[PDB]
Amino acid sequence: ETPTYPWRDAETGERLVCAQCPPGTFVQRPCRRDSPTTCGPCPPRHYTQFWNYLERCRYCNVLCGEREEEARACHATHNRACRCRTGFFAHAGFCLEHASCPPGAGVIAPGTPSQNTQCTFSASSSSSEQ
Numbered sequence: 001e002t003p004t005y006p007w008r009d010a011e012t013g014e015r016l017v018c019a020q021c022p023p024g025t026f027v028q029r030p031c032r033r034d035s036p037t038t039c040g041p042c043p044p045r046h047y048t049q050f051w052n053y054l055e056r057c058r059y060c061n062v063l064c065g066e067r068e069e070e071a072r073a074c075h076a077t078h079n080r081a082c083r084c085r086t087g088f089f090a091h092a093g094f095c096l097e098h099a100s101c102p103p104g105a106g107v108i109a110p111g112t113p114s115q116n117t118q119c120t121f122s123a124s125s126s127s128s129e130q
Helices: none
Strands: 004-008 015-019 025-029 038-041 068-072 081-084 088-090 095-097
Touching (some): 081 088
Antiparallel strands (some): 004 015, 025 038, 068 081, 088 095
16 A cells, blocks of 8 residues: 556566555666565655655755744755744735734733734833733
């Protein structure tokens, strides 16, 4: 029940069924008559998430930037993923700032990396006071 793919041999040409490579690995060398598939590990900054017949690993193209922090790094199976830093939230792609709330009707729901701030007395206009 190990995943597979067909392949044709280099020396004269013979048709065979080569085993796929597990997540974390890539196809280093295909099958010969005697040996099956050679699976080598994904190099630094490169990943394979699935069972594959990839000649070389996928590059970790996701790079967190100014206002982004990591969620997963780039390992042999993960691709790097990003999320917004403490005082930021994601809107429409870009990662924008959390909204402050003045005195009056202060913060009822704090800013998550996912949503903006929702909002007796409040002394200050921050994104904290209740």
